Amino acid sequence: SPDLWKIWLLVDPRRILIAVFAFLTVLGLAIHMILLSTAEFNWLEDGVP
Amino acid sequence: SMTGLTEEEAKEFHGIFTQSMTMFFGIVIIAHILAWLWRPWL
Amino acid sequence: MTGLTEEEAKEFHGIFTQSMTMFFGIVIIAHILAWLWRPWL
Amino acid sequence: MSAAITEYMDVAQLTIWAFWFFFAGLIIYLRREDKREGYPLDSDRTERSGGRVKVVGFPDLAEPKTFVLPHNAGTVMAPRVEAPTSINATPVAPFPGAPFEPNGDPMLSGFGPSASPDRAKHCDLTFEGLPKIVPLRVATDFSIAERDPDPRGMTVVGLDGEVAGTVSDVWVDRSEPQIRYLEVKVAAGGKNVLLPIGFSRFDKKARKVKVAAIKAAHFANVPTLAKPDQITLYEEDKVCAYYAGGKLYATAERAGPLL
Amino acid sequence: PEYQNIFTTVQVRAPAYPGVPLPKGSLPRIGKPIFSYWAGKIGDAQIGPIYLGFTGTLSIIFGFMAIFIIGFNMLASVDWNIIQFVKHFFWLGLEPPAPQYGLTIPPLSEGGWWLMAGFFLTMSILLWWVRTYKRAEALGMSQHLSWAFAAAIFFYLSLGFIRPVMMGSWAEAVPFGIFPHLDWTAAFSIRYGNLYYNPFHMLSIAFLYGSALLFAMHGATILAVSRFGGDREIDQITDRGTAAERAAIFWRWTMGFNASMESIHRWAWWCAVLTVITAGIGILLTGTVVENWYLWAIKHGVAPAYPEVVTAVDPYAT
Amino acid sequence: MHKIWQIFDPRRTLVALFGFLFVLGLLIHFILLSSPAFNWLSG
Amino acid sequence: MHKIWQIFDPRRTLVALFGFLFVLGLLIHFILLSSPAFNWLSGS
Amino acid sequence: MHKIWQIFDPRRTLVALFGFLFVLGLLIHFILLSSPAFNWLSG
Amino acid sequence: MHKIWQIFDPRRTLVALFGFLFVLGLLIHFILLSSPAFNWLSGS
Amino acid sequence: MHKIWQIFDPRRTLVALFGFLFVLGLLIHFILLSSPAFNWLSG
Amino acid sequence: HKIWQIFDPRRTLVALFGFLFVLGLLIHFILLSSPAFNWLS
Amino acid sequence: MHKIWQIFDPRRTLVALFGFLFVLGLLIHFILLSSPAFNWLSG
Amino acid sequence: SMTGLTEQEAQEFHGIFVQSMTAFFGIVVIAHILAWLWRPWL
Amino acid sequence: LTEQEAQEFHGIFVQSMTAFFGIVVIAHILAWLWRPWL
Amino acid sequence: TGLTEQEAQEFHGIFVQSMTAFFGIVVIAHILAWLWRPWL
Amino acid sequence: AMLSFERKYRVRGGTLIGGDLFDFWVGPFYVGFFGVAGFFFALLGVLLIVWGATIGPNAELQTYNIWQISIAPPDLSYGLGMAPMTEGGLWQIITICAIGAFVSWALREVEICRKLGIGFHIPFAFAFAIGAYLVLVVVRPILMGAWGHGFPYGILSHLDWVSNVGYQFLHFHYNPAHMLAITFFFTNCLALSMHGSLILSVTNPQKGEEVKTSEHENTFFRDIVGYSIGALAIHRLGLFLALSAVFWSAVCIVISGPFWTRGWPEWWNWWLELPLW
Numbered sequence A: 001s002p003d004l005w006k007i008w009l010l011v012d013p014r015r016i017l018i019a020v021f022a023f024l025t026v027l028g029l030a031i032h033m034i035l036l037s038t039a040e041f042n043w044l045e046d047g048v049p
Numbered sequence B: 001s002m003t004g005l006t007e008e009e010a011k012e013f014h015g016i017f018t019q020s021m022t023m024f025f026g027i028v029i030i031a032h033i034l035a036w037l038w039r040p041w042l
Numbered sequence C: 001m002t003g004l005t006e007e008e009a010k011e012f013h014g015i016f017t018q019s020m021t022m023f024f025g026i027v028i029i030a031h032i033l034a035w036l037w038r039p040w041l
Numbered sequence D: 001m002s003a004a005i006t007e008y009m010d011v012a013q014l015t016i017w018a019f020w021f022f023f024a025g026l027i028i029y030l031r032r033e034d035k036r037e038g039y040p041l042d043s044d045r046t047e048r049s050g051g052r053v054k055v056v057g058f059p060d061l062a063e064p065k066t067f068v069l070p071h072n073a074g075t076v077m078a079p080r081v082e083a084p085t086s087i088n089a090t091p092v093a094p095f096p097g098a099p100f101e102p103n104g105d106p107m108l109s110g111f112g113p114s115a116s117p118d119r120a121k122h123c124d125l126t127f128e129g130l131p132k133i134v135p136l137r138v139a140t141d142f143s144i145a146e147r148d149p150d151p152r153g154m155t156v157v158g159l160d161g162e163v164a165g166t167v168s169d170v171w172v173d174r175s176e177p178q179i180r181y182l183e184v185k186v187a188a189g190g191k192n193v194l195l196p197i198g199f200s201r202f203d204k205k206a207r208k209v210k211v212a213a214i215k216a217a218h219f220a221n222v223p224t225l226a227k228p229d230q231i232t233l234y235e236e237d238k239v240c241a242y243y244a245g246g247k248l249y250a251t252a253e254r255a256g257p258l259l
Numbered sequence E: 001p002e003y004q005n006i007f008t009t010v011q012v013r014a015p016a017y018p019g020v021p022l023p024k025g026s027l028p029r030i031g032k033p034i035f036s037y038w039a040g041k042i043g044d045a046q047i048g049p050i051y052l053g054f055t056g057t058l059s060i061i062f063g064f065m066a067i068f069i070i071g072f073n074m075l076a077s078v079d080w081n082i083i084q085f086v087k088h089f090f091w092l093g094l095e096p097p098a099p100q101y102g103l104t105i106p107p108l109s110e111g112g113w114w115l116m117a118g119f120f121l122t123m124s125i126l127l128w129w130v131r132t133y134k135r136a137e138a139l140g141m142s143q144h145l146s147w148a149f150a151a152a153i154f155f156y157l158s159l160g161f162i163r164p165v166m167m168g169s170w171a172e173a174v175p176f177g178i179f180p181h182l183d184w185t186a187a188f189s190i191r192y193g194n195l196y197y198n199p200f201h202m203l204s205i206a207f208l209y210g211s212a213l214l215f216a217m218h219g220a221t222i223l224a225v226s227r228f229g230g231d232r233e234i235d236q237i238t239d240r241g242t243a244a245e246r247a248a249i250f251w252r253w254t255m256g257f258n259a260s261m262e263s264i265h266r267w268a269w270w271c272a273v274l275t276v277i278t279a280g281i282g283i284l285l286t287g288t289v290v291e292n293w294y295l296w297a298i299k300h301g302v303a304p305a306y307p308e309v310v311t312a313v314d315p316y317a318t
Numbered sequence F, H, J, L: 001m002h003k004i005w006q007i008f009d010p011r012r013t014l015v016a017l018f019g020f021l022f023v024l025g026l027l028i029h030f031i032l033l034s035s036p037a038f039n040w041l042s043g
Numbered sequence G, I: 001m002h003k004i005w006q007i008f009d010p011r012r013t014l015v016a017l018f019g020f021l022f023v024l025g026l027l028i029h030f031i032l033l034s035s036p037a038f039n040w041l042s043g044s
Numbered sequence K: 001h002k003i004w005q006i007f008d009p010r011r012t013l014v015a016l017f018g019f020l021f022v023l024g025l026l027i028h029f030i031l032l033s034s035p036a037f038n039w040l041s
Numbered sequence M: 001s002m003t004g005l006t007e008q009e010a011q012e013f014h015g016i017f018v019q020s021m022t023a024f025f026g027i028v029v030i031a032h033i034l035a036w037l038w039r040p041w042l
Numbered sequence N: 001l002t003e004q005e006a007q008e009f010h011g012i013f014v015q016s017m018t019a020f021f022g023i024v025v026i027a028h029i030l031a032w033l034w035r036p037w038l
Numbered sequence O: 001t002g003l004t005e006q007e008a009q010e011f012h013g014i015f016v017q018s019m020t021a022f023f024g025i026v027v028i029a030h031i032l033a034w035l036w037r038p039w040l
Numbered sequence P: 001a002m003l004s005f006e007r008k009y010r011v012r013g014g015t016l017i018g019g020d021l022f023d024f025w026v027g028p029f030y031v032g033f034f035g036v037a038g039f040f041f042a043l044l045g046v047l048l049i050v051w052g053a054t055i056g057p058n059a060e061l062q063t064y065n066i067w068q069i070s071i072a073p074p075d076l077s078y079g080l081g082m083a084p085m086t087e088g089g090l091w092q093i094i095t096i097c098a099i100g101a102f103v104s105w106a107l108r109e110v111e112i113c114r115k116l117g118i119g120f121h122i123p124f125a126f127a128f129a130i131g132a133y134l135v136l137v138v139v140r141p142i143l144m145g146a147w148g149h150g151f152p153y154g155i156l157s158h159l160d161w162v163s164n165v166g167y168q169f170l171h172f173h174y175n176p177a178h179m180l181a182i183t184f185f186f187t188n189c190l191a192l193s194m195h196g197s198l199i200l201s202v203t204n205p206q207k208g209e210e211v212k213t214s215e216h217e218n219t220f221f222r223d224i225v226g227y228s229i230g231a232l233a234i235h236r237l238g239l240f241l242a243l244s245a246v247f248w249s250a251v252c253i254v255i256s257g258p259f260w261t262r263g264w265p266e267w268w269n270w271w272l273e274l275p276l277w
């Protein structure tokens, strides 16, 4: 896209930052919890070391 | 207009937003490289 | 759009960066101590 | 497709977690709709900073929404901004959270239970554009139900049982056929004041209207209307608020405490 | 004491309101309105008129066929004895097909009549939904009622159609009867290991409890400020009066936060809708992705553990 | 006849009539499907 | 027969007609799927 | 089809579309995880 | 044929059509995943 | 520290503190009553 | 003796009497829960 | 760091801070009492 | 008179309605011929 | 809304529907090649 | 929506360009997914 | 803070007890005498709940899982006397704290009602919820003769109590007061969705439309069901449905055990045994 900066003319680049930071945190929490649910990728109960 | 943001401000915000997102992606890539070295999933 | 001038935005950023850095410093030291106590990987 | 996502995760667990994300988003939406009235908040936090800090909590305020009033009465924005208003009272103590003591005569102070906003100075209109709250003298096709006592001619008594006047007329809602106000002819100066039906206790056997809110002598200071045959939204609040102040100001014993 | 605004002391009679005019090409409203005195003491005295359009007429025909089939099978189940019909009426019902038929159409008395009653009732409910959609549209109103009705329909379809199809058996569906559908409700929980431990059953109860909480709060609130004309909620929403301010302030002083005269109805709308949305989801999860809710709760650390003061020797473990 | 439409609204009657016929048609097909002797969707 | 549209509104009739046809189509497809002799989603 | 934005608000459409894609992305990932053949988190 | 859009609002038709088609497309994919003959995520 | 009373008013503070201390005192006594080794009413 | 300029002596007596009675009830019930000090046996 | 009090109200901060510390203090004591390894009232 | 449609307006819609219905019935007839070849039901 | 916009929308609607149906036909041809259902 | 054809042509241009970019990496993802474990 | 229109309503007086001593606000909350009492009733009750969780049923079963935390009432062998703290006595103290907190909350609402000069419907409606709680932990246990009939204080354990009490009558759906209470609950939820929908659909009309009137509200439900109860009466009806549901729920549980010990379906044998059939 030659002009992608024009996105900030229709979405406020303040509530977008809050939404992005909240969204990334929740997604990051979810993926960690998904891995903890897994018998292979649970790094706290795998006994290694 | 819609967001009270001028064309110059949007150019300013986009440049650093891209820079911050690029650096965030860079940390993510390093994290996944370390994760792949630790325990690959594919 | 916050009522914060240019100088306060830089001044707050300076103290914020130091406070975040010192907090990150203590966190790193804590995790080094935690790793020595009981490594998790 | 199976019920198990991992060794521990299953579809039911994902579905309940999916609901919590939606429910969290829903509460944020509802809280945002809640804050379309009375925001930004009034606080010493704002007062001490000279308006530099707005108290809105989380979530912050939403964009203004438009209510297009019928019969081109104007468009009202819900998250609006109102002019600062000065209360007719002084604090009992200077610490934050302390209450206020109304100045002068509490009934006429317009503070506390007698406080009221300044609503629009126009009558509420029916679907056809006629004034909604009108007396029975102009709502001719309206009439009292046959099995119910006609309020006209009943005696109005105050909190102390003293006669305050007689019901000269009944004001009814034209859109929904119910009684709203009793027009009382005060037997002190012959000036007709409105009595909201919510402050009226009918005594059918004695044809008496009991008003526990205020004394008989307080009917002389009930706010009056500019036009005798219609009442604006502004005047409805003023009349109702005056009687409401009586529930706390009519007698010394009403301020409490019981013990 | 003070007028509590629970009953209308003095009612006023006006000529019956025909209704807001409908757009061109709409059927005239049927019925000459009357005035019930006792209905006017608690509410509005006028009964009627009603609008019975094409969709409402079709819903009536489909609905009667379902009810007639249900009642006929109830009467058949007591061998036509109308006296025994009245005696056993609460216990009578139209059973769904037996498990051995799966999703196929069984004979009439072996679940075939149930499918017809289920289909005709479903069609009348869907037709009634279209009717609620059109009445709101004809008056220029929004479709909040249709959305809420669709949420209730979703739960109704989950009970009798969607879940039985997912399970591959009509025998999982709800019988048409007073006590029989209560027996189904109890058996459903028993069969799938104590529905109390279904988290969407827990949520549904929270919203059903919350609906009674909100309506008690909102209903008492509006009656408390009705002396300031708080019942005229449209006016309070468009032009905030002292009734709306005192109502909001009461709840702010009580629990630290408050709604508006408009947003309290959004809380009300969502609490009621989420009752049946979570109800439908919890039903769809049961038997499809969870076999035993209590064991699911044990797996996820939700069920409490009690000291083993009483235990039974398992006779199968020998 | 023909005057039956002077007391019966043709608009309301046709919808009621067509709705009843559609319900009746569905009902009869359902009954035949329920009957093993007349179910046409078997082997 | 063209006067049927002087009795019934074409817009409302077309929506109701399409709605009934779609529900009828789902009904018939479901009946065929429910009948084992005509269930095409079985691989046989 | 540039005219499609005459009737669809660019701000409303964009956020709704991005939310729609995210839940679809979650749905497909989770469906694959439920499948033992495509579950990449198992050993 | 083009006359249909006089009575049917194009703005309302498109959103309803897109919502209907997505639900229909989602339903068919789910039906196929339910049927063992056409479940492509079983590995066989 | 006398300027703490310029921050916390002695009205709300002095009754909150007494309530917190009383609940704290009750809680500790209840904790000891619930501990068999420190239950002084056991006999 | 300056406590009475911040606490109304007439409202305090009601709260004081309510507090002491509630406290006395709790202690009696605690003693009743204790078999060693349950006098109603 | 003295400028944090030009950002945060000292009165609102102390109430939030003191309330948090009291709850945190209770929480840790309760956690220790819930583990028999650190329960100091068991004997 | 109950729908606000003139004789010509009703005449022209009926022409399109009949033509559209005919094409729909044509596709339906073809679909049933194909269905009969796949699996006859009588 | 007007009469002239009706043909304008209809032309884009028909082409969009035709393109959507075209992809659908291709998908079903591929689906039939993968695993025929009749 | 109060959006004239002047501003409905460059929003569409970016929207199509962004959609092509989004669809571009989707295809690469599915090619990698197909190589890892084909589903047909 | 306070709402932008709130300051003119913050008036001294209207307290039932305490006068000027406790008549103040803490943030948004009004405290008063019963706010102070209610807060420390709640504080002690919560702290004893946490302590009850800290000791748990026993050391091995002790858990801080919020779903599994449970403070159980005494054994029935203790009757109506006090139990040792770790054998149900903690439940008895928490119950007393809960009653103190709930009544203080209701009485604090009364003081707020007096300050605002509004009706007392809200504290009156809340008293029904308190009365239902009082039936569960006071009236029914006293009628049954033991504090051990109260439900345990745990998020999931009090569901196990409801389940087992329900199956003490073999089929609790046949409880006639239970059926009536459920009818009011379901009707209330239906009436709440209808009322919320009608208000929202009128104040948020179709695109490019003005706010509708009271005529539209009455016309809408007359067009659907042929009757409109009215803008004022729907709030009476909603209050009546919600309070009737709780009243009949209190009846349904207080007759289960105290006034009926057989299976609930057997209660309907009065109808089945009528000589008419």
Ligand code: BCL
Residues within 6 Å of the ligand: A021, A022, A024, A025, A027, A028, A029, A032, A035, A041, A043, B020, B021, B023, B024, B027, B028, B029, B031, B032, B035, C041
């Ligand atoms: C499972 C195998 C590994 C592991 C594999 C991975 C992989 C792979 C990743 C992580 C990532 C993260 N892991 Mg890890 N992680 C593990 C165990 C943990 C444990 C734990 C106690 O066990 C914790 C607390 C964490 C925590 C974290 C976070 C630091 C980070 C996600 C932050 C985020 O969502 O920001 C989102 C929210 C924001 C607000 C981001 C803001 C971005 C700004 C603009 C950039 C500057 C940031 C600024 C300085 C503030 C710092 C915040 C940082 C994001 C930390 N991991 C185990 C041991 N983890 C992710 C990561 O690296 O993110 C950086 C990631 O990709």
Ligand code: BCL
Residues within 6 Å of the ligand: F018, F019, F021, F022, F023, F024, F025, F026, F029, F032, F038, F040, G028
């Ligand atoms: C033994 C079972 C036989 C069978 C034996 C019969 C017999 C016998 C009859 C039918 C009839 C019908 N069958 Mg068959 N039918 C079978 C299986 C099917 C299957 C299937 C998937 O298996 C389907 C979809 C149908 C469908 C139909 C309908 C086309 C028709 C009922 C229409 C109706 O009720 O109008 C009522 C609903 C309305 C809305 C009426 C209004 C009509 C329209 C809207 C107005 C048009 C006006 C116009 C001028 C009048 C002519 C209309 C004509 C229908 C063209 N049959 C099996 C194979 N079927 C009936 C029939 O032929 O009717 C025409 C009939 O008598």
Ligand code: BCL
Residues within 6 Å of the ligand: A001, A004, A031, H018, H019, H021, H022, H023, H024, H025, H026, H029, H032, H038, H040, O017, O018, O019, O021, O022, O025, O026, O027, O029, O030, O033
């Ligand atoms: C199952 C086999 C593979 C796998 C197979 C696939 C396949 C196949 C796909 C993915 C896709 C995704 N996978 Mg994967 N994936 C796996 C496991 C994971 C795990 C994990 C915890 O293991 C995670 C976190 C992910 C995460 C992701 C996301 C990066 C992505 C979904 C994007 C989305 O939802 O958009 C929804 C949200 C939005 C659209 C928001 C809009 C905002 C963004 C920024 C849109 C930008 C538009 C455009 C690109 C802008 C650029 C323009 C230019 C700069 C000018 N996968 C496993 C290991 N995955 C999809 C993908 O590649 O999408 C990109 C995809 O097709």
Ligand code: BCL
Residues within 6 Å of the ligand: J028, L018, L019, L021, L022, L024, L025, L026, L029, L032, L038, L040
């Ligand atoms: C291993 C378990 C050990 C134990 C190990 C520890 C350890 C380790 C610590 C404590 C600490 C505390 N322990 Mg210990 N403690 C044990 C058993 C107990 C028992 C008991 C009955 O068994 C009690 C009542 C206590 C009580 C206490 C408190 C005195 C203190 C936590 C106070 C707090 O949270 O402040 C938070 C609440 C506030 C700050 C609210 C303040 C209210 C007023 C309005 C503000 C005034 C501020 C004032 C001007 C300045 C404060 C500091 C001053 C210099 C004093 N412990 C057992 C035997 N305990 C902590 C401590 O020493 O803190 C001082 C600590 O680190």
Ligand code: BCL
Residues within 6 Å of the ligand: E185, E186, P102, P129, P130, P132, P133, P135, P136, P161, P162, P163, P164, P165, P166, P167, P171, P172, P173, P178, P181, P182, P185, P245, P246, P248, P249, P250, P251, P252, P253
């Ligand atoms: C196997 C079990 C049986 C059964 C056995 C029982 C038993 C036993 C009971 C019920 C009770 C009820 N059952 Mg039953 N019931 C069954 C099946 C059903 C079904 C169904 C769909 O099958 C339904 C809809 C119901 C419905 C009902 C209600 C009528 C009633 C619960 C509402 C109530 O009591 O309000 C009352 C509301 C309260 C008590 C709430 C009190 C609120 C207090 C005052 C405030 C607390 C404040 C709080 C601490 C604040 C926290 C602070 C936060 C920060 C907010 N039951 C099955 C068949 N049922 C209960 C009942 O009737 O009790 C009266 C009851 O005891």
Ligand SMILES: CC[C@H]1c2cc3[nH]c4c(c3C)C(=O)[C@H](C(=O)OC)c4c3nc(cc4[nH]c(cc(n2)[C@@H]1C)c(C(C)=O)c4C)[C@@H](C)[C@@H]3CCC(=O)OC/C=C(\C)CCC[C@H](C)CCC[C@H](C)CCCC(C)C
Residues within 6 Å of the ligand: E209, E212, E213, E216, E217, E220, E254, E255, P038, P041, P042, P043, P044, P045, P046, P094, P095, P097, P098, P099, P101, P102, P105, P109, P122, P123, P125, P126, P128, P129, P152, P153, P154, P155, P158, P242, P243, P246
């Ligand atoms: C009677 C009709 C319905 C109703 C009405 C109603 N409820 C009300 C009101 C009204 C009118 C209020 O005014 C009042 C309020 O403030 O609402 C916001 C309230 C209220 N109803 C509430 C909850 C509630 N209502 C319920 C039910 C109902 N309330 C009925 C269905 C339920 C159910 C069904 O479970 C709950 C959980 C609160 C949000 C609030 C009262 C707040 C209160 O009393 O605060 C004081 C107590 C605390 C701050 C904390 C608790 C302190 C205790 C010592 C802890 C122990 C509690 C318990 C004994 C153990 C834990 C319970 C277990 C089961 C987990």
Ligand SMILES: COC(C)(C)C/C=C/C(C)=C/C=C/C(C)=C/C=C/C(C)=C/C=C\C=C(C)\C=C\C=C(C)\C=C\C=C(C)\C=C\CC(C)(C)OC
Residues within 6 Å of the ligand: E067, E068, E070, E071, E072, E105, E115, E116, E118, E119, E122, E156, E157, E159, E160, E161, E173, E174, E175, E176, E177, E178, E181, G027, G030, G031, G034
């Ligand atoms: C005036 O009336 C007379 C006297 C003429 C007749 C009187 C009749 C009487 C007294 C009837 C009484 C009826 C009663 C008491 C009914 C009680 C009903 C209850 C309590 C029902 C409760 C729940 C029922 C549910 C939830 C049923 C749900 C069923 C569904 C959703 C079924 C869907 C079925 C479908 C869509 C069928 C598909 C069929 C397939 C195979 C396509 O068909 C071929």
Ligand SMILES: [Ca+2]
Residues within 6 Å of the ligand: A042, A043, A044, A045, A046, A047, A048, A049, C039, C040, C041
């Ligand atoms: Ca490890």
Ligand SMILES: [Fe+3]
Residues within 6 Å of the ligand: E218, E222, E233, E265, P195, P199, P235
């Ligand atoms: Fe309302």
Ligand SMILES: [Mg+2]
Residues within 6 Å of the ligand: E095, E175, E180, E183, E184
């Ligand atoms: Mg049965």
